[PDB]
Amino acid sequence: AGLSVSDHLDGQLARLCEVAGADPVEPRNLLAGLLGPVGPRPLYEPPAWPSGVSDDHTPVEFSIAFNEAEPPTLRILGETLGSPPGPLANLSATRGFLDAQARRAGLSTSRLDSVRDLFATDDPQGDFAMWCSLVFRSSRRPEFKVYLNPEVKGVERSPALVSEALHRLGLGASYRALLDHGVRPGELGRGDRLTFFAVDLHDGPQARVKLYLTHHEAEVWDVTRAASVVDGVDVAEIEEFCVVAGGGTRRFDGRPLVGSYTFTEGADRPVGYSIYVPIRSYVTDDQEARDRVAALLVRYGFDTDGLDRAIAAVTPRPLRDGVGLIAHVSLRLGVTVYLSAEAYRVSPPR
Numbered sequence: 082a083g084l085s086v087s088d089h090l091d092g093q094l095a096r097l098c099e100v101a102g103a104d105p106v107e108p109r110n111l112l113a114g115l116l117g118p119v120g121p122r123p124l125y126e127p128p129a130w131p132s133g134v135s136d137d138h139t140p141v142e143f144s145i146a147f148n149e150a151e152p153p154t155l156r157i158l159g160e161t162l163g164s165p166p167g168p169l170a171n172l173s174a175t176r177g178f179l180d181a182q183a184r185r186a187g188l189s190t191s192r193l194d195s196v197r198d199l200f201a202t203d204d205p206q207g208d209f210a211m212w213c214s215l216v217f218r219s220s221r222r223p224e225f226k227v228y229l230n231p232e233v234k235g236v237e238r239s240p241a242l243v244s245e246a247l248h249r250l251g252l253g254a255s256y257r258a259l260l261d262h263g264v265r266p267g268e269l270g271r272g273d274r275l276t277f278f279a280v281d282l283h284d285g286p287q288a289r290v291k292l293y294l295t296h297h298e299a300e301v302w303d304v305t306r307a308a309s310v311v312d313g314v315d316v317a318e319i320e321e322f323c324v325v326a327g328g329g330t331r332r333f334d335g336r337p338l339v340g341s342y343t344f345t346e347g348a349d350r351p352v353g354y355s356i357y358v359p360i361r362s363y364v365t366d367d368q369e370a371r372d373r374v375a376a377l378l379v380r381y382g383f384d385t386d387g388l389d390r391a392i393a394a395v396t397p398r399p400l401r402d403g404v405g406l407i408a409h410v411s412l413r414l415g416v417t418v419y420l421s422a423e424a425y426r427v428s429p430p431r
């Protein structure tokens with residue numbers, strides 16, 4: 082037959098697993114589950130639905146996280162499209178996949194369950210309600226993360242939705258620090274958007290949430306001021322990261338900078354921060370993006386062999402021949418590289 086989406090993505094994952102030394106059986110089984118009805122869909126058919134997961138609407142994005150003294154972590158972000166694809170049908174299918182995997186792995190989901198009704202709506206707003214992250218490592222069983230849309234009941238309701246969800250979980254003080262002292266003056270739900278509310282599927286020993294903010298048309302000065310509410314972050318290091326990844330850009334007026342905040346029990350400041358540069362918006366092509374990411378990995382004492390092998394695993398195409406393979410690069414206070422499936426489109430060089 083013609084190639085399917087599964088044919089393309091399953092091959093990418095199999096090769097990425099070898100690069101990371103992760104066992105491929107369970108990851109490839111989980112990707113097939115996550116794809117649902119998209120898996121068998123021919124590549125020569127247009128996307129089943131305009132998924133926001135990736136620019137070409139492939140409903141999956143790969144990433145490789147380089148960790149100080151630990152083998153790289155491979156992750157898949159994506160969603161399961163519904164039977165007639167659509168916002169509510171996609172939520173049902175994605176939650177169906179996750180709930181089946183919770184049951185299979187014997188996970189407790191009481192923390193996630195405790196906030197379900199705050200996100201639940203018959204008329205979900207925006208291009209998703211729930212995404213899935215699958216997390217793979219050498220010598221660990223896969224981990225599941227759930228990405229909820231804070232704007233699912235509309236952008237206006239997002240701050241109150243997040244406030245009430247964090248209060249229920251026994252969090253809220255670090256979040257209060259971010260809303261009162263970490264958001265650009267007069268920009269909440271405007272320039273500063275609540276983009277993801279991310280939790281482990283499995284109840285951990287303590288409540289933990291990763292909140293992602295999108296900083297529209299933002300100065301690095303303002304994004305690092307937002308970051309400065311986090312314990313022990315170096316604003317200089319974040320700016321250095323942004324200068325290298327952005328090629329000298331100070332105003333990210335293309336695709337926006339994104340920050341994530343890790344909220345934990347008993348803390349009044351976030352305990353973790355990541356900056357996500359959408360590097361595809363600030364380069365001519367993937368050769369230039371690869372060169373910038375390699376410079377960042379070298380500065381951090383990482384091996385560029387892992388990066389080049391992960392790139393080659395995803396696609397053999399000349400890096401000069403397009404842009405957006407390297408979709409994002411992020412600094413965690415290690416370095417994470419986000420690699421596009423390009424199942425539908427290779428964005429041309431710019």
Ligand SMILES: N[C@@H](Cc1c[nH]c2ccccc12)C(=O)O
Pocket residue numbers: 133134135136142158339357359409419
């Ligand atoms: N493709 C979307 C969602 C997304 C995928 N990977 C991401 C990493 C960080 C932030 C957002 C994303 C975007 O670029 O916005």
